[PDB]
């Protein structure tokens, strides 16, 4: 309603207050809170979980293609797409006005363009799935009258769209859509830190948070070299024992990455290095390499903790926040 | 005051990972992110290392969604450490600036 008032009466009492810089920050913050509300409300039917198992298909009417029901856009979905178009248009104008170089030279501009592009890719993927479902639906309504798709054997290209989630292809657009949509939603709530500098209590906290992230970035490079040393070394050791291990810890480069990454948080078990065979020499080397990796990782973390403490030891946070 | 910063990070991944895994209720190793409550439970106990990595594993062959959950859950743990590390350092510097005796008396 406030937006409508601006169009009808740009120059009025409402116009001057709406043009205040504080009220234009509040309006932009208010619109984004609505956008996050639309994101949460879009999944409001699944807050307590889904009643239907992913193995069973439910259709609103008997002749419907199942993929039509799971890909159709709802009224909340359309609002999110429009809000993204509105947000992308603002980013495109800033890219054109400011310039394709300065635009990038800002943390928020690249992040905002990143999350809006993932939203567009998520909606583009779902749109492609919707088009495929309609093509399958078009065949049914114009060629099938076989009492709710019971006895009729559809062609394999069209029969695929009557399947449940378990029979979906691993790379079909619907799975890609919700995978990218999840990333965008997580990136969306990161924009809450865009309005945090305005507050006198949480503003300094975000300034110090960004400073630590920049400090950690240079320390990661040191730990990547340590991480890659043991990822290749332990994968090479255990690559030949694929079916001869308690688990799949270091059998592949990916599994070697997974195990060593979650060892940072203590989420990788010691049985990652245990062999089923009697080759104790290789198993004991894996114990030492995995033990050295944990000790080395602590030392790198301990060095990062101490160095960043001394960096802060040398009323400056107030100046940076203001 | 530092919790408020972490609540925003916590709520970002609670909604994001729940949305990702809500459709895989019976298609997961456990009930980690199938509901908003389960998404809250998993992410809260990940602070203390009490949530297993199988929280993100799917029974189906949808490796794209499973690998996104791995990255989102991996980013959440890294982000949570950074927030905790920032809180630890900031509070150390706050104390660096016979005053405890005055406040106690
Ligand atoms: C970039 C930063 C560098 C930091 C350097 C960190 C390395 C220093 C830590 C050393 C702790 C050893 C950490 C290694 C701990 C080994 C953990 C283990 O469970 O092994 C059981 C195995 C078989 O039963 O025991 C042995 O079979 C060997 C005896 C243990 C002594 C091995 C020597 C390890 C490395 C020595 C150098
Ligand atoms: C508010 C404070 C902000 C703090 C910022 C913290 C974020 C920085 C941490 C980044 C560590 C990445 C932490 C992410 C670690 C991923 C953990 C994992 O087990 O994934 C296995 C998956 C599938 O097998 O591996 C991939 O499929 C992808 C390759 C790994 C690289 C992914 C890029 C992740 C994010 C990059 C940005
Ligand atoms: Ca911007």
UniProtKB/Swiss-Prot annotation, chain B:
It comes from the Eukaryota. The chain crosses the membrane at residues 1-22, 63-88. Residues 23-62 are extracellular. It is found in: Cell membrane. Expressed predominantly in brain and at much lower levels in ovary, colon, small intestine, lung, prostate, placenta and testis. Belongs to the transient receptor (TC 1.A.4) family. STrpC subfamily. TRPC3 sub-subfamily. Homotetramer. Interacts with ITPR1. Interacts with ITPR3. Interacts with MX1. Interacts with RNF24. Interacts with JPH2; the interaction is involved in maintaining Ca(2+) homeostasis in skeletal muscle and is mediated by JPH2 'Ser-165' phosphorylation. It is linked to Spinocerebellar ataxia 41: A form of spinocerebellar ataxia, a clinically and genetically heterogeneous group of cerebellar disorders. Patients show progressive incoordination of gait and often poor coordination of hands, speech and eye movements, due to degeneration of the cerebellum with variable involvement of the brainstem and spinal cord. Forms a receptor-activated non-selective calcium permeant cation channel. The cytoplasmic portion of the protein is required for channel assembly and gating. This is Short transient receptor potential channel 3. It comes from Homo sapiens. The chain holds residues 652 to 759 of 921 of the full protein.
């Amino acid at each position: 309603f406030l937006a409508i008032g601006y169009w009808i009466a740009p120059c009025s009492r409402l116009g001057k207050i709406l043009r205040s810089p504080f009220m234009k920050f509040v309006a932009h913050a208010a619109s984004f809170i609505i956008f996050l509300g639309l994101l949460v409300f879009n999944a409001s039917d699944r807050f307590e979980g889904i009643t239907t198992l992913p193995n069973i298909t439910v259709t609103d009417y008997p002749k419907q293609i199942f993929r039509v029901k799971t890909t159709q856009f709802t009224w909340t979905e359309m609002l999110i797409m429009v809000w993204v178009l509105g947000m992308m248009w603002s980013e495109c104008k800033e890219l054109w006005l400011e310039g394709p170089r300065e635009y990038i030279l800002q943390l928020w501009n690249v992040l905002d363009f990143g999350m809006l592009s993932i939203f567009i890719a998520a909606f583009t993927a779902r749109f492609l799935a919707f088009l495929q479902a309609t093509k399958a639906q078009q065949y049914v309504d114009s060629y099938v009258q076989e009492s709710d798709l019971s006895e009729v054997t559809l062609p394999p290209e069209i029969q695929y769209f009557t399947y449940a989630r378990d029979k979906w292809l691993p790379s079909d657009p619907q799975i890609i859509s919700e995978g990218l949509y999840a990333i965008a939603v997580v990136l969306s709530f990161s924009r809450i830190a865009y309005i945090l500098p305005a507050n006198e209590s949480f503003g300094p906290l975000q300034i110090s948070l960004g400073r630590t992230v920049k400090d950690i970035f240079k320390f990661m490079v040191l730990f990547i070299m340590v991480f890659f040393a043991f990822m290749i070394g332990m994968f090479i050791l255990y690559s030949y024992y694929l079916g001869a291990k308690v688990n799949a810890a270091f059998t592949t480069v990916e599994e070697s990455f997974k195990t060593l990454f979650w060892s940072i948080f203590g989420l990788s078990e010691v049985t990652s290095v245990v062999l089923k065979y009697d080759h104790k020499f290789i198993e004991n080397i894996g114990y030492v390499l995995y033990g050295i990796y944990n000790v080395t990782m602590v030392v790198v973390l301990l060095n990062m903790l101490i160095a960043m403490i001394n960096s802060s030891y040398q009323d400056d946070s107030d100046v940076e926040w203001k």
